[PDB]
Amino acid sequence: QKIHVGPGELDDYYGFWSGGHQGEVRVLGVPSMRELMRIPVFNVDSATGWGLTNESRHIMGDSAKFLNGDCAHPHISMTDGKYDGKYLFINDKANSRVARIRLDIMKCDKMITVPNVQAIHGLRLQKVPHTKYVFANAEFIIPHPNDGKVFDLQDENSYTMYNAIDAETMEMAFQVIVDGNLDNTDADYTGRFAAATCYNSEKAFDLGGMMRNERDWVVVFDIHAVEAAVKAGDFITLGDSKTPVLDGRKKDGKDSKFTRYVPVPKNPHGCNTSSDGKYFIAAGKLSPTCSMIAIDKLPDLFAGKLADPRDVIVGEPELGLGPLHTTFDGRGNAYTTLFIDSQVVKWNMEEAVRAYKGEKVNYIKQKLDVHYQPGHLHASLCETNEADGKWLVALSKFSKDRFLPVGPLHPENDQLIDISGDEMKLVHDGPTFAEPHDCIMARRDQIKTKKIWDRNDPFFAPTVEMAKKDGINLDTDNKVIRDGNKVRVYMTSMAPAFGVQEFTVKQGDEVTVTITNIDQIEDVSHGFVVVNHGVSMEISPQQTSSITFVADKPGLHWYYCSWFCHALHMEMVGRMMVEPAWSHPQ
Amino acid sequence: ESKQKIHVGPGELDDYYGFWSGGHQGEVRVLGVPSMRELMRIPVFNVDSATGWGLTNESRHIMGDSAKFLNGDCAHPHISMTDGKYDGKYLFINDKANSRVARIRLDIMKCDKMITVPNVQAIHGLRLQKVPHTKYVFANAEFIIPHPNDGKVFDLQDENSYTMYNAIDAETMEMAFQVIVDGNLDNTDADYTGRFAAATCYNRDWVVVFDIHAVEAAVKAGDFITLGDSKTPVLDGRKKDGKDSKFTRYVPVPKNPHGCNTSSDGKYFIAAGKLSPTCSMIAIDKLPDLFAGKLADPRDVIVGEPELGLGPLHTTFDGRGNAYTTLFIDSQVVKWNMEEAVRAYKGEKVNYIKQKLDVHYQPGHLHASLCETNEADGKWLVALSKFSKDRFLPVGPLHPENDQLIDISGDEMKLVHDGPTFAEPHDCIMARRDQIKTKKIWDRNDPFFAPTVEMAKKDGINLDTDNKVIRDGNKVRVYMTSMAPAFGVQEFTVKQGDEVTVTITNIDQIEDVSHGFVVVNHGVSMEISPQQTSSITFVADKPGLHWYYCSWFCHALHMEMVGRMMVEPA
Ligand code: CUA
Ligand code: CUA
Ligand SMILES: [Ca+2]
Ligand SMILES: [Cl-]
Ligand SMILES: [Cl-]
Ligand code: NA
Numbered sequence A: 001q002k003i004h005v006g007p008g009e010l011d012d013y014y015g016f017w018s019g020g021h022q023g024e025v026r027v028l029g030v031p032s033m034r035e036l037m038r039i040p041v042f043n044v045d046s047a048t049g050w051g052l053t054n055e056s057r058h059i060m061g062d063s064a065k066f067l068n069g070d071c072a073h074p075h076i077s078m079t080d081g082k083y084d085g086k087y088l089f090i091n092d093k094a095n096s097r098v099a100r101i102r103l104d105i106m107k108c109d110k111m112i113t114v115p116n117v118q119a120i121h122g123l124r125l126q127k128v129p130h131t132k133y134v135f136a137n138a139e140f141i142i143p144h145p146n147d148g149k150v151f152d153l154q155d156e157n158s159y160t161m162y163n164a165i166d167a168e169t170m171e172m173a174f175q176v177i178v179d180g181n182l183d184n185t186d187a188d189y190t191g192r193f194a195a196a197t198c199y200n201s202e203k204a205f206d207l208g209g210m211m212r213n214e215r216d217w218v219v220v221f222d223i224h225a226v227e228a229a230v231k232a233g234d235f236i237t238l239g240d241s242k243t244p245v246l247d248g249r250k251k252d253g254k255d256s257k258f259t260r261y262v263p264v265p266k267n268p269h270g271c272n273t274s275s276d277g278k279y280f281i282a283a284g285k286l287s288p289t290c291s292m293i294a295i296d297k298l299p300d301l302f303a304g305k306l307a308d309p310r311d312v313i314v315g316e317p318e319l320g321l322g323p324l325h326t327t328f329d330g331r332g333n334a335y336t337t338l339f340i341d342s343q344v345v346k347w348n349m350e351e352a353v354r355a356y357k358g359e360k361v362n363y364i365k366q367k368l369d370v371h372y373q374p375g376h377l378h379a380s381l382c383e384t385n386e387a388d389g390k391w392l393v394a395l396s397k398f399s400k401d402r403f404l405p406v407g408p409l410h411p412e413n414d415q416l417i418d419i420s421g422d423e424m425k426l427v428h429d430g431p432t433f434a435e436p437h438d439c440i441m442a443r444r445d446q447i448k449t450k451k452i453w454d455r456n457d458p459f460f461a462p463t464v465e466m467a468k469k470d471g472i473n474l475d476t477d478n479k480v481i482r483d484g485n486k487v488r489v490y491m492t493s494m495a496p497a498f499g500v501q502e503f504t505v506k507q508g509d510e511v512t513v514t515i516t517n518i519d520q521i522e523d524v525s526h527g528f529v530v531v532n533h534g535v536s537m538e539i540s541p542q543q544t545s546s547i548t549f550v551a552d553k554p555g556l557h558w559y560y561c562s563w564f565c566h567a568l569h570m571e572m573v574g575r576m577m578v579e580p581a582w583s584h585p586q
Numbered sequence B: 001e002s003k004q005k006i007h008v009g010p011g012e013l014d015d016y017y018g019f020w021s022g023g024h025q026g027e028v029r030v031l032g033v034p035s036m037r038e039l040m041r042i043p044v045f046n047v048d049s050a051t052g053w054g055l056t057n058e059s060r061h062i063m064g065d066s067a068k069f070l071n072g073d074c075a076h077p078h079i080s081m082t083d084g085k086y087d088g089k090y091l092f093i094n095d096k097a098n099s100r101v102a103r104i105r106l107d108i109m110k111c112d113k114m115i116t117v118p119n120v121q122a123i124h125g126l127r128l129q130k131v132p133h134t135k136y137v138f139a140n141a142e143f144i145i146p147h148p149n150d151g152k153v154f155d156l157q158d159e160n161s162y163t164m165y166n167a168i169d170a171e172t173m174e175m176a177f178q179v180i181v182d183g184n185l186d187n188t189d190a191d192y193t194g195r196f197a198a199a200t201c202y203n204r205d206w207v208v209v210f211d212i213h214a215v216e217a218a219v220k221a222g223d224f225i226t227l228g229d230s231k232t233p234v235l236d237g238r239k240k241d242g243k244d245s246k247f248t249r250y251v252p253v254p255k256n257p258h259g260c261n262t263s264s265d266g267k268y269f270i271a272a273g274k275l276s277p278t279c280s281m282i283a284i285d286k287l288p289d290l291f292a293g294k295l296a297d298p299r300d301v302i303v304g305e306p307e308l309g310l311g312p313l314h315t316t317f318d319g320r321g322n323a324y325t326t327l328f329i330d331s332q333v334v335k336w337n338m339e340e341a342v343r344a345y346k347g348e349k350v351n352y353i354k355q356k357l358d359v360h361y362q363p364g365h366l367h368a369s370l371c372e373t374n375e376a377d378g379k380w381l382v383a384l385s386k387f388s389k390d391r392f393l394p395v396g397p398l399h400p401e402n403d404q405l406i407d408i409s410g411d412e413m414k415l416v417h418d419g420p421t422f423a424e425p426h427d428c429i430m431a432r433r434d435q436i437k438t439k440k441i442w443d444r445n446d447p448f449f450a451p452t453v454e455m456a457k458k459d460g461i462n463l464d465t466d467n468k469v470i471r472d473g474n475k476v477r478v479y480m481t482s483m484a485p486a487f488g489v490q491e492f493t494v495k496q497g498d499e500v501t502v503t504i505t506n507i508d509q510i511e512d513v514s515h516g517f518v519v520v521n522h523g524v525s526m527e528i529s530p531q532q533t534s535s536i537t538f539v540a541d542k543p544g545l546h547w548y549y550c551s552w553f554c555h556a557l558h559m560e561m562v563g564r565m566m567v568e569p570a
């Protein structure tokens, strides 16, 4: 299998890496493991202006005030259990958000703050019939309402919630109150069932208290029952949020219609659906096991045809110390990270099932040493029924001496492993910044990108509407619109010239500069920087972008095109002249 | 033969550090060479969610008032030198967007100082004194502006409209002096003695040469002015009625010249012709006669002007006598022999061109290993090309820069790797592995957080041991140690509206056990490495219980390393 991508050769897969604590999404080529693009999401990006432009801040809403995010879980939308290449979704634990990225323009186009929750961590997509819902875990128990009167996690109104976001509208669909808390989550291959691990069944805040129970659980959601209750209006609302809220807690030992609690040891973490649709597989973490939940036994479980919730477990292989996460080659094998043993263990799922029934069989096929302390891992197309068993990435936390020293901070070691055969083979150590934690791969033919924006693209449609109120045709106009103490500059740009090369304002004026790149050639990006005003953005071919700033300094102030666009790139400059406040009314 | 191993397999280490400009994104990146893998990101002019740079009090103190800016535009990274060789102390980098120079300490891989250059706009070209050491950082301000720039005069041809050449004291990161010039400044470099520096310039254009010794003598005697509210000594290096300054000479060079590169034997300032398909070679050994008025014509210091190809932009050196120049239009790197060019300029029939290698596509800068030092080793070359076209998978409307690694160890250049990079790094610098010595554990006395140690002292806090909440009006100062997997303060209570500062000291002593600190839904994030103190300030404007958690994976029980901030309603 081709391991190295030479000058002139192209990668075979796209890889979408979480940006970890840094807050972006990164596009890599696989197997070269080189970063091809950065997609700003929860970070403020100086290069493109994401977080500074009006278009990006409009998408971020009120959360545009935050300069940080904490990503972990990137996933690609699906149709009939295969990637369809339309959207990527990612979580923000730091400020409780979910973001959607459009894979044709490789930009975040929608973002939502999940109401009435703290810390959006685990995130996974419905597989079948398509990604109608984005499922997202809120990790931490909070009071409801969280108004400062009650702080006790054991109060009857202190809880966290499972969250479902409409993937296409990026509005909330519903929320399910659960017992305990939520860690990771996955979905079945029918649309009926989703599942989440819980590590805090104790609802504690101290470390010992969170580890008290021998078993926490994976909570299983009957989404069909949830949708039925919403359509019937059997729900409540919290605060000023109109999101339907359903109660999935046990009340005095009796189950709700919406949930079932399957005892699983211990502080389990990973929650992974096998590519054949047979199992929710939970990684035991503090327990040296994984637990295998038979999805075809869930209808019976929710119908009361089983006596004990444990009866849906058909395997609990002992695997090694600190199992965290599992992935699949599509050949019947599972691959699980062992954080403490520092390995990836390859095991046969159907043989583990037989061992649970008492048959002595060695389901463990191979243990590969990794370097070191692996968290999550990802096999190519593992979240689809097209799981191809070619590439595996294990994302290890402590890189130690695997790379040159670079001061007190260390990179994550994202190691590429060849799993096309019976023997796992380590082929590449990829260092990455701010702990990506997890990633997702797609074949080259599953991603189709645009090189030239459409003029009606929704990403800047609000800006087009603003332009229209000023009577502006953005494709042609080079005009300075004045409006009180607001100035709206509209210009085309075509390398190597700004359509407006100078304009004059009053000190204190609020200046909006809107640029429409009317070059129609691939890869002629322009930039726009106003010197010493903290203003910077990118404008790709046929895009409109805009940015607003206060002309708070009198005098002449240069602006320039930041992105190398033309042999005369260095002459693509202009001047803003700011008349001093003392020559104007006060 | 060019035969070097290009593959760094698992368990093997790179041979060089590469320091990449972060381009329009504003950071510095540390790469391993020859793998071309990114080992680390160093935040500088960007705000980094991961480490908290731009949010923490320590970082905002370094940035000063410019902490209000969330952007930067980097191009020119360079490493400090002693006796013409890299000494591993500091990296310096420019910010064209908000007119800054930043210093990175290579032992901790953090920006530790930053200056806004006064009375200029757009710090672009930047390079370091070589000899006897990097006393000065030299920085070009690109754009001509009025002086003062108070909105009375906007005319760029006015007598008081100009730009200036800037010298920053490398060790103090305070301004040393500024020299007014004629024209706009592009790129700059320094000689191997400390007397001379030079910059490409325009409005045939020129390479202006600076007699730094003469500038220093005038500062010592007090023959300077100051501008506005900056105490920086300002010297006038302009021509006046055809009469030369004592500080400058203008050497005519065609045409809109761009790169300005000192050969590693110290013989030449080489200016890349750009619009002229040439480079111009200025003989540094003739500059003293030039300034002494002993030459008849400024063009007499030009000892070579080889024709190389269309659009020469930048030049580097293998230490074997060859120069390598990017041809932007022809889209190549051309290898040529400098002494043969000098003889050709005299009329000898000698072909100084050795090889042209196609690169992909439109190269700007290039960099050979140790090229800025008299130890230039002729092993690796990186050419940084702007239009990557079909060399990588398509990724939407934006495109990566193509930073191509070329083996120059033998007679023939060989292209070995295409490295895609984000936001047009533009230029880079390499150092031998043994030229860089980094700390894995912080020193408790490090100046990076010494202002925070000082704050702790006024509160009576021993940062190494204490877990205490200090109340001070509507200000709350939490101090805590952290040791995986537990925050030393796991809960604290404040009043809605309080201004909370959380100072965390990581007292783990094992390498690479970093902790984080994130306050959910408050925009608060930072990293604390072993034996570091880091602090962050935010207002508790929302009543109720608000979780904080450790963001950096520190322990098997990392997920459980959490705490609770309780906010009582107003
Ligand atoms: Cu437009 Cu460079
Ligand atoms: Cu401390 Cu994770
Ligand atoms: Ca537990
Ligand atoms: Cl998972
Ligand atoms: Cl240069
Ligand atoms: Na939204």
Ligand code: NA
Pocket: B062, B064, B113, B114, B115, B173
């Ligand atoms: Na400073």
Ligand SMILES: [Zn+2]
Pocket: B075, B076, B365, B426, B427
């Ligand atoms: Zn440059």
